[PDB]
C-alpha cells in the first residue's frame, strides 16, 4: 500500500504457524503485555480483531542472539556516574540488575540530579529507590516503541487504544499525485524512507551529468559512469501507483548516501503520507454528527487529495479438441460499430477510453469442421473504466516460455484517477477517523477575518470522552509553525524559554519542526509561542493567545458569537473508498447443487438473510414477507420465472411453491439408509418429484 506497510511487514513477530498456537486454542494469558517486553516488543502496535496479541512488531533498538533470544542495549553506570559503554542484555540477565529510566535528569558530568529515581527491579517491580544502587540506564526514551508508533507526535498525551488505532491506520494510506512533508513531525521519517528502499540513493560520489524524467547519469571521480533508471507508473500489489521522480539538477555535486530520486510517499527524502489542512473545531448544522466530516470544494478543484489506481486483465489462448483458439479482429457475431477501437491483431490500442461492458481483446473458438466460430472475448467487467496504458503480449512461436497447452498470452493495463467524494474515509495520526458527510462550496464555509475559508470541520464532542488530546496540541503547534514566530530578548530570555535552544527562538513562515515521541515540546513552551507569532500581510493577528479565532458565517453573514479553535492538522486518505463497496442485484447467476444466488461482488452475488434476521421477522409478525424472502427469491425455481413475468406484465404475484433445498436434504437423509417419507392426511406418501 505504501512504504511504511512494506517496512512493517518485514519486522513482524507471529505466534502462529506450523509449530505454534491456534486462534481458538490461545487463551487470555498469551495475549498480555508481559513486563519483559520492555525493549523487545511493542505494547501498542497490534491487530484489533481476533488476532489481538498474537502478532507484534520488533522494537527499533532490538537485535537477535545467535540462539534466538532478543537483546536490547543499556548504558553502564558506576559510582553514580553514567558512562558511555553499551552492553546488550537478554531478558534473563536484566532481572538481576537495577535498571534506571530514560527520563532522568543528568548533569554535565553525568550525575543524577534528583535524590531518588524510578527504576525497574527483578520481577518488573517498579520502585522509587535512592539513586545510589542503579547499575544500568536506558539508551533513549523511544527504546520501547516500533517504527510506526515512533511517528506520532505528542504520543504521551494519547490513550493506548487511540494510539493503537493511529498506528494501525498509518499503514493504510494511499499515495497521492503530489506529496508534501508534515509541518510538525518526529524525526523518524527520514530513516524510515531510506531503509524502506522506495527511494534511489547514490552508491558513490560524483557530479550529475544528465537528468531526464526516466534516467540520471552520474560521473564518478575515478572516471566510471553509472546510470540509474526509474519506474514510471508501475502497479503495486494492491493496485496503487509506484512512481519515482528525480530531485537533482544537471550540475549538482552528489555525495555517497545522498537521495537522488523520490518515491511513492516521499517528499525530498522523508516520508509524507498526507496533507496539511486548516481545521476548525465546532459543530456545524449536524453534518458532522457522530464522527462525520465536512470538507471544502477547494480540495476537489485543486487536486489536493487525488490518487491513481491501476488495474490488470489477462486472457489465454489455448488449443482445443475441436481446434485451436486464435486471437483476431474478425468476429462474425458482433457488429462493426463496436470493433472500431481494435487494431490489426484483435487487441485495443493504447490511449482508448474503455467503459463497462466494452471490448478489450477479440477471440473466437472453432467448433469443428464453415460457421463453427463461437464468440469468447475479454470484456471490461461491470462498473469499471479508465484509459489503456500498456499491453504485453507473449507468444509461443517467438521462442518464449509458456505453459503447456496454451499458445498466446496478453495483458492489458487500465488506469483511472480518483478524486475525493462522499463516503471516503479520512484519518489522522492520533485516532481520528470518519467518513465524509458533505462537501461544501467555498462560499458556504466559515472564514477568518481576512476572508480565508477553512478546509475541514471536526466535531468537539468526540475529543474529551476518548482521551486523545494530542490532536489539539498538534493543531496549536502547526498554526505556530505555519505563521512563524519570534521571541523577544530585549530584557534577556524569558523564564519560560530558558530550556529552549538558541535556534528555536526565531522561525520563518512555513517552517518545519520536530517533536520526538517522549521528549518534545512542553506546554509552557507552546503557551509562550502562541503569543509570539508573526502577523500577516496587514498588521493583524488572527489567532489570540488561547489559539482561538473569531469566524464569520458564510450562509448568513453574521459573526459567530464565540471564538473557535483554528489551526493546521495532518490528514491522510485511507484505502477504503465508496466506489469499491457499492453493489446491487435483481437477478443473475445461480448455484448448482442448491439453486440459490451466488455470493460475492465479483460474481454478481446476493446478500445473505441469516438466522438472526429471521428472528426479527418472526418477532414483527410478518408471515408473508418471510415466506416470499425464503421461497420465490431464493429457491423456488418455477416461481421465479412466473414472478418475473407477472412483474413485467403488470399482473399479480403468484403463490410460492416448494424450495429445492428441502429435496436436497431429503435425498441426503435417504443416502444414509434412513427411510424418511412425507405423508398426507390419510397416509399415501406423496411423490415429491413433480413431472406431471
Amino acid at each position: 500500500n505504501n512504504p511504511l506497510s512494506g517496512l512493517t511487514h518485514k519486522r513482524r513477530l507471529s505466534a502462529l504457524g506450523p509449530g505454534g498456537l491456534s486462534r481458538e486454542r490461545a487463551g487470555l494469558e498469551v495475549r498480555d503485555v508481559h513486563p519483559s517486553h520492555y525493549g523487545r516488543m511493542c505494547p501498542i502496535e497490534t491487530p484489533e480483531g481476533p488476532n489481538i496479541g498474537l502478532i507484534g512488531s520488533l522494537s527499533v533498538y532490538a537485535r537477535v542472539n545467535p540462539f534466538g533470544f532478543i537483546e536490547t542495549p543499556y548504558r553502564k553506570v558506576v559510582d553514580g556516574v553514567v558512562s558511555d559503554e553499551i552492553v546488550y542484555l537478554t531478558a534473563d540477565e536484566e532481572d538481576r540488575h537495577v535498571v534506571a529510566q530514560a527520563n532522568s535528569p543528568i548533569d554535565a558530568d553525568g550525575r543524577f540530579v534528583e535524590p531518588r529515581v524510578l527504576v525497574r527491579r527483578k520481577a518488573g517491580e517498579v520502585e522509587y529507590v535512592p539513586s545510589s544502587e542503579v547499575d544500568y540506564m536506558d539508551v533513549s526514551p523511544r527504546q520501547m516503541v516500533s517504527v510506526a508508533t515512533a511517528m506520532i507526535p505528542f504520543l504521551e498525551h494519547d490513550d493506548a487504544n487511540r494510539a493503537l488505532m493511529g498506528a494501525n491506520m498509518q499503514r493504510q494510506a494511499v499515495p497521492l499525485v503530489r506529496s508534501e512533508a508534515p509541518l510538525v513531525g518526529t524525526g523518524m521519517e527520514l530513516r524510515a524512507a531510506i531503509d524502506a528502499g522506495d527511494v534511489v540513493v547514490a552508491e558513490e560520489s560524483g557530479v550529475i551529468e544528465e537528468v531526464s524524467a526516466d534516467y540520471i547519469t552520474v560521473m564518478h571521480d575515478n572516471g566510471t559512469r553509472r546510470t540509474y533508471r526509474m519506474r514510471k507508473f508501475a502497479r503495486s500489489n494492491h493496485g496503487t501507483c509506484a512512481n519515482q521522480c528525480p530531485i537533482v539538477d544537471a550540475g549538482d555535486r552528489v555525495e555517497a548516501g545522498q537521495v537522488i530520486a523520490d518515491g511513492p510517499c516521499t517528499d525530498d527524502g522523508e516520508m509524507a503520507l498526507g496533507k496539511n489542512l486548516l481545521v476548525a473545531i465546532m459543530p456545524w448544522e449536524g453534518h458532522n454528527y457522530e464522527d462525520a466530516i465536512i470538507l471544502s470544494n477547494r480540495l476537489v478543484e485543486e487536486d489536493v487529495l487525488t490518487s491513481i489506481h491501476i488495474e490488470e486483465h489477462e486472457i489465454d489462448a489455448r488449443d482445443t479438441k475441436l481446434g485451436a483458439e486464435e486471437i483476431t479482429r474478425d468476429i462474425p457475431n458482433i457488429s462493426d460499430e463496436v470493433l472500431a477501437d481494435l487494431d490489426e491483431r484483435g487487441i485495443v490500442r493504447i490511449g482508448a477510453e474503455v467503459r463497462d461492458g466494452d471490448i478489450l481483446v477479440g477471440k473466437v473458438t472453432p467448433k469443428g469442421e464453415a460457421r463453427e466460430v463461437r464468440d469468447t472475448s475479454l470484456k471490461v467487467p461491470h462498473g469499471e473504466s479508465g484509459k489503456v496504458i500498456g499491453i504485453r503480449v507473449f507468444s509461443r512461436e517467438d521462442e518464449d516460455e509458456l505453459p503447456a497447452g496454451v499458445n498466446e498470452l496478453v495483458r492489458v493495463y487500465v488506469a483511472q484517477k480518483r478524486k475525493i467524494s462522499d463516503g471516503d474515509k479520512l484519518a489522522g495520526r492520533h485516532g481520528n477517523k470518519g467518513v465524509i458527510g458533505k462537501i461544501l462550496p467555498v462560499e458556504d464555509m466559515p472564514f477568518l477575518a481576512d476572508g480565508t475559508p477553512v478546509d475541514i470541520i471536526l466535531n468537539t464532542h468526540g475529543v474529551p470522552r476518548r482521551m486523545n488530546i494530542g490532536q489539539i496540541l498538534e493543531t496549536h503547534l502547526g498554526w505556530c509553525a505555519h505563521s512563524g514566530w519570534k521571541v523577544d530578548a530585549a530584557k534577556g530570555v524569558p523564564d519560560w524559554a530558558a530550556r529552549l535552544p538558541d535556534e528555536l527562538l526565531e522561525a520563518q513562515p512555513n517552517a518545519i519542526v520536530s517533536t520526538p515521541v517522549f521528549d518534545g515540546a512542553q506546554e509552557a513552551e507552546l503557551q509562550g509561542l502562541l503569543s509570539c507569532t508573526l502577523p500577516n500581510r496587514d498588521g493583524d493577528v488572527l489567532v489570540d493567545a488561547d489559539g482561538k479565532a473569531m469566524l464569520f458565517d458564510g450562509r448568513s453573514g453574521e459573526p459567530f458569537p464565540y471564538p473557535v479553535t483554528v489551526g493546521y492538522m495532518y490528514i491522510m486518505k485511507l484505502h477504503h473508498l465508496v466506489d469499491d463497496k457499492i453493489h446491487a442485484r435483481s437477478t443473475g447467476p445461480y448455484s448448482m447443487i442448491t439453486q440459490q444466488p451466488l455470493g460475492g461482488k465479483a460474481q454478481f452475488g446476493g446478500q445473505r438473510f441469516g438466522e438472526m434476521e429471521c428472528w426479527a421477522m418472526q418477532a414483527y409478525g410478518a408471515a408473508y414477507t418471510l415466506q416470499e424472502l425464503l421461497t420465490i427469491k431464493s429457491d423456488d425455481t418455477v416461481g421465479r420465472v412466473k414472478v418475473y413475468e407477472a412483474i413485467v406484465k403488470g399482473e399479480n404475484i403468484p403463490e410460492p411453491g416448494i424450495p429445492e433445498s428441502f429435496k436436497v436434504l431429503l435425498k441426503e437423509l435417504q443416502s444414509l439408509c434412513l427411510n424418511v417419507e412425507v405423508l398426507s392426511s390419510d397416509g399415501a406418501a406423496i411423490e415429491l418429484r413433480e413431472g406431471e
Binding site: 558511555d84 529552549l500 535552544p501 520526538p516 513552551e525
Partner: peptide
C-alpha cells in the same frame, strides 16, 4: 542529521543520544 543531504528540521529535544538506530 548524519545523512549527506537532508532538509533542516529543528528539534525540541532536550536529551542527547549515545547510539544510532
Amino acid at each position: 542529521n548524519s545523512v549527506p543531504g537532508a532538509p533542516n528540521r529543528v528539534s525540541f529535544a532536550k536529551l542527547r543520544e549515545p547510539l544510532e538506530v
